[PDB]
Amino acid sequence: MPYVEIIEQPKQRGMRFRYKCEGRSAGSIPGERSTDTTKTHPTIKINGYTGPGTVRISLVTKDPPHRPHPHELVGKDCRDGYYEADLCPDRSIHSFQNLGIQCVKKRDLEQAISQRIQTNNNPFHVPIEEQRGDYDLNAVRLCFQVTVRDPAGRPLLLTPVLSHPIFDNRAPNTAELKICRVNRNSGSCLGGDEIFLLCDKVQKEDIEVYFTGPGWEARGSFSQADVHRQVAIVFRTPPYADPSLQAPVRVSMQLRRPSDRELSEPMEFQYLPD
Amino acid sequence: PYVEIIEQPKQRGMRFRYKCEGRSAGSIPGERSTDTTKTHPTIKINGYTGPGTVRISLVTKDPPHRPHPHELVGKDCRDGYYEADLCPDRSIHSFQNLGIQCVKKRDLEQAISQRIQTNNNPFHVPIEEQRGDYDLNAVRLCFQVTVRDPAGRPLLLTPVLSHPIFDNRAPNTAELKICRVNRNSGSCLGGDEIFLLCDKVQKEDIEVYFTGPGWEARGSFSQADVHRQVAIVFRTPPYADPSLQAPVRVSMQLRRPSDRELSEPMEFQYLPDTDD
DNA sequence: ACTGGGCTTTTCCAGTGA
DNA sequence: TCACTGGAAAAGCCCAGT
């Protein structure tokens, strides 16, 4: 058979899943190369075939076995929690720009899973015995199921392909880490400089400030009481890899979730002598 | 006779509990209750001393004082109101287990219907004036005292209303509090940037208020400088004297402009400035 | 057993501004 | 004109401690 390739994966972090109460459509999963000058979207290329067909996109769990996910895909040409539309006969590349993730409430879990089985939404045909186990409601994968045609018009189900995982920004343990503001970004190599850091919502047991620089790994000092309402950290800076120096040296300041080694975008911190 | 509230309830700082949270309803304390001496909402009946009954219900904060969708819960409470006998020997009566159980928005109509169905409307507001927007974060207590006349007949005295009782989860009405500040001194010329961590505020209804002898000045910040309602980044105002010879102590505090409410003050020291 | 406070889960809303 | 977007508010949950 021909095959399906993901030319632009979905963006992993930053987007929050939206409940059904917040509207009909849930925005659009952005392409991972989406600038802001540019607005890219998840795209697939169909190799070895060009012509009519069908493309279905559904949500499966992040980890194998990739059971159907309780959450729903909503937006253009979405029904029963999955996307399904005619493949464009003229084009071999296909953009999906209206895919929103609608999260199911925890008290509607077993019913949502029932609808997956009822609608034959099971791209990897996992037995129902294993649709019993726990679901990570903060992470999904896109599953592209493309049906093409043989030379006589016989449906040809191409192998389903899984995207990178998409994480819910609603959950602070899966959200994007962002440093919004600091009272200063310079200090002495002796350390002890008090820093007030403003950040996106974090969890005080699963957070730390990560100073790095070639071959040196330091860590801001604070306690869980020094995290104010999940969105601010008051910590003391660590010493530089040299209580000496003379030169103004620049290093990296990052938030870190130890549970998954996830880093915020780096902020620059300038260690100064004396 | 007439009814007189001689200790109002405590306004701010007590949390309404949903029926889903178990009960956990609590007890409204007196307006001047302390940890050294606990006080409770207390009324005084003037012109009568004898047998009688009292009903306490919830009414809206604003006129018309319709019955509130919330419920009073606790001992001797039923159908959202309190009712029991008064003391037949004195004219001063306290109530010690009054708790406010809040109804959710989707259960609003069911609650108002129960108020009507139970004849819980002390000001007999017509059902026309009874579908407005309700403030689910503010209630008033309504005391309805029934008294005997010299004949022996129930005499319902006019209902008296308490001051508003607020949910502390509403930020427009909660107590203002400074938790952490990165700087308690700065140049008398102003302009020092300061990070302030506070309890939840509203970025459109908050100020940083510097006070002194006939002196008031405000920190400079925009709404974008308020981070998730719990952090303010502002720059200091200049002091009244741009040529200080010695540090001067002023008080710094949060302030809510819409209701003139202020947080606890905090010591800030303006310093002499050298050369800019 | 019964409250006091933080957080999570779910819902609501205002404006923005290409 | 409008899904969308991000901030905020409301509803529910959970733990600790007495």
Author numbering:
A (entry chain B): 18 to 291
B (entry chain A): 19 to 294
Pull verbatim passages from the article behind this deposition:
Sequence-specific binding at the weak κB site (2ΔS) was retained upon mutation of strong site for both dimers, demonstrating that NF-κB has the capacity to bind this weak motif. To further evaluate whether the binding by NF-κB dimers to weak κB sites is specific and authentic, we determined the crystal structure of RelA homodimer in complex with a weak κB site (−5G−4G−3G−2  C−1  T0T+1T+2T+3C+4C) present in the promoter of the Cxcl2 gene (the non-cognate base pairs are underlined and the pseudo-dyad axis separating the two halves of the κB site is marked 0T). The Arg33 and Arg35 engaged to the −4G−3G of one half-site, as predicted. However, the presence of non-cognate bases (−2C−1T compared to −2A−1A, the cognate bases for the RelA homodimer) influenced the global DNA architecture such that Arg187 is positioned slightly differently, but more importantly, R41 could not engage with −5G of this weak site. This altered protein–DNA contact likely entails the weaker interaction, which nonetheless is specific. Taken together, these results reflect an enrichment of weak κB motifs in the regulatory regions of NF-κB target genes, which can indeed be recognized specifically by RelA; however, a more elaborate mechanism must underlie an efficient occupancy of these weaker sites. Interestingly, X-ray structural studies revealed that the global nature of protein–DNA interaction is preserved regardless of the difference in binding affinity and despite both the protein and DNA undergoing conformational adjustments in forming the complex. The in vitro affinity of individual weak κB sites to NF-κB RelA homodimer or p50:RelA heterodimer is often undetectable (i.e. Kd > ∼1500 nM). These sites often deviated from the consensus at several bases.
